[PDB]
Curated annotation (Swiss-Prot), chain A:
It comes from Homo sapiens (Human). It is found in: Cytoplasm; Nucleus; Mitochondrion outer membrane. The record marks R54, R72 as: Interacts with activating enzyme. The modification (Microbial infection) ADP-ribosylthreonine is found at T66. Changing G76A: Loss of ADP-ribosylation. It comes from the Eukaryota. It is a peripheral membrane protein. The chain holds residues 1 to 76 of 229 of the full protein. The modification ADP-ribosylglycine is found at G76. Exists either covalently attached to another protein, or free (unanchored). When covalently bound, it is conjugated to target proteins via an isopeptide bond either as a monomer (monoubiquitin), a polymer linked via different Lys residues of the ubiquitin (polyubiquitin chains) or a linear polymer linked via the initiator Met of the ubiquitin (linear polyubiquitin chains). There is a cross-link at K6, K11, K27, K29, K33, K48, K63 (Glycyl lysine isopeptide (Lys-Gly) (interchain with G-Cter in ubiquitin)). This is Ubiquitin.
Curated annotation (Swiss-Prot), chain B:
It comes from the Eukaryota. The active site is at C14 (nucleophile), H255 (proton acceptor). Hydrolase that deubiquitinates target proteins such as ARMC5, FOXO4, DEPTOR, KAT5, p53/TP53, MDM2, ERCC6, DNMT1, UHRF1, PTEN, KMT2E/MLL5 and DAXX. Together with DAXX, prevents MDM2 self-ubiquitination and enhances the E3 ligase activity of MDM2 towards p53/TP53, thereby promoting p53/TP53 ubiquitination and proteasomal degradation. Deubiquitinates p53/TP53, preventing degradation of p53/TP53, and enhances p53/TP53-dependent transcription regulation, cell growth repression and apoptosis. Expressed in neural progenitor cells (at protein level). Widely expressed. Overexpressed in prostate cancer. Induction: Up-regulated in regulatory T-cells (Treg). Down-regulated during neural progenitor cell differentiation. Residues 5-312 form the USP domain. It is found in: Nucleus; Cytoplasm; Nucleus, PML body; Chromosome. This is Ubiquitin carboxyl-terminal hydrolase 7. It is linked to Hao-Fountain syndrome: An autosomal dominant neurodevelopmental disorder characterized by global developmental delay, varying degrees of intellectual disability, autism spectrum disorder, poor or absent speech, and mild facial dysmorphism. Most patients develop seizures. Additional variable features include hypotonia, hypogonadism in males, and ocular anomalies. Isoform 1: Phosphorylated. Isoform 2: Not phosphorylated. Belongs to the peptidase C19 family. The C-terminus plays a role in its oligomerization. Monomer. Homodimer. Part of a complex with DAXX, MDM2, RASSF1 and USP7. Part of a complex with DAXX, MDM2 and USP7. Interacts with MDM2; the interaction is independent of p53/TP53. Interacts with DAXX; the interaction is direct and independent of MDM2 and p53/TP53. Component of a complex composed of KMT2E/MLL5 (isoform 3), OGT (isoform 1) and USP7; the complex stabilizes KMT2E/MLL5, preventing KMT2E/MLL5 ubiquitination and proteasomal-mediated degradation. Interacts (via MATH domain) with KMT2E/MLL5 isoform 3. Interacts with OGT isoform 1. (Microbial infection) Isoform 1 and isoform 2 interact with herpesvirus 1 trans-acting transcriptional protein ICP0/VMW110. Binding to ICP0/VMW110 may modulate the substrate specificity or activity of USP7 to stabilize viral proteins.
Amino acid sequence: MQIFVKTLTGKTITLEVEPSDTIENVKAKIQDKEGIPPDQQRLIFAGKQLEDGRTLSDYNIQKESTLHLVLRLRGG
Amino acid sequence: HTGYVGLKNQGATCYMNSLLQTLFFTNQLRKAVYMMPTEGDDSSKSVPLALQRVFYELQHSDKPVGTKKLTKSFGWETLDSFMQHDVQELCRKLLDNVENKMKGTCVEGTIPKLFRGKMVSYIQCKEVDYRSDRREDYYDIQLSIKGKKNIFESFVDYVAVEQLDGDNKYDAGEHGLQEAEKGVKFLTLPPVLHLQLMRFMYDPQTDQNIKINDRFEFPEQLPLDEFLQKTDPKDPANYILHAVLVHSGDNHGGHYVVYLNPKGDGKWCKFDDDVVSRCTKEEAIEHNYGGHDDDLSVRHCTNAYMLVYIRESKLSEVLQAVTDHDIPQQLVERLQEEKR
C-alpha cells in the first residue's frame, strides 16, 4: 500500500509499505528513496512519535495516510 | 492578587507549566477531569490522578503548585524528554490518557467534544477521473509561519495542494501511478482550537535547525468561516483568543511563559511559573508577534509558538463555572491525605 511522508522541507513523498512493516523498516525505505539516514528520522502520526519496533498496523496507519518527519529537538 | 495561582519552577520542563495553565482554564475539561474514576489508580503511575491533583491545587492553593508527581506519572523526569517532544505532543499524551480514562463514565467524549475537528484529505488525479477523499480527525493545527504575515496566510498555506508527480506519483488503483494533487479541506473546526506556530524549521541550504523570530500576526478575534466547506449562519466559525504560549530564546530552551484571559473577556494575565500578574492586551498579543531582529535584547527572541482560541458560540460551555461541588468528595479527601 502507498502512504505519504512529509519531509522537513515540506515535500510530500510516497512510500510503498505493508501493514506488517515496523517503523524502523519505514525509515529504511525513506533512506532508500530520499537518502535520509534513519538516525536523523523522527516520525509523527496522530500527534505522537512513532516507536521503531512497532508496526504500521499497530498504529492503524492505512493506505493514503500521511506521516511527518520532524526535528530531533523540537521542544524545550 | 489576580486570584490565579502559579506553578513552581521545578526544573527544565520548558512549555509544561504553560500547557498546564492553558488546560486548567479549559474549564469544561477541568470539570471532566475531576469526574474520572481514579480510586483504583496507583498514584506513582496515574496521569489521570496526577492531573486531578494539579488541577485541584491550581483551584484551591494560595501558594505555587508543584508538578513532580505529574512528571513522574508520565515518565519525563529529564530535560531531554521535554527537549525532544514539543508542547502539542505532551498535550496529546495527556489528553489521550484522560480520554481513555473517561470511557464508560459520565464524561465520556469530553476530549473529542472540545478538541477534535474533521477534515477531508483528498487526492485528485490530473488526467484520469479518479479522486480519493478520506476523512481525518485532527486535534490541533500546525501552522507554517515563515514567509507568512498572519494566521490567514498560514491557513491558506495549510490548505494549499501538494503535487504528486515524478518519483512521487499517486497509486490510483487500476489506473496505476498517476499525477495527482493532494490537499486538505476543513469540514469542522472544534470548540477549542490549538494552533501551533512552527517557530523552528529546517533550513535546506544549511542542514540546520534554525529559530524563526520573524513577525507573525494573530488577532484577538479570528474569523475562519471561509476555510470551511460549508458554513452555518447561526454558528459562524468566529474564534476568540484565549491563550498565547511564549518562548524567549533562539535555541530549544530558555524562558517559557503563557498569557491567558481566563474568562474570554480580554482581561489578560501573564503566568510566569510562580508569578501571575495582570498585563496589558499588547503584552499578551502584539508584543509576542516577533519581528525585532535589529534589537539586541531578549525581545529579539521572544515570540509566540502556540495559540489557543475558543469558538465564540461555545465560550459559555467551555468556560463554564467550576465549583467545589464539581470535585467528588472522595477525591478531595484522597488528595488531602496525600498532603501529609
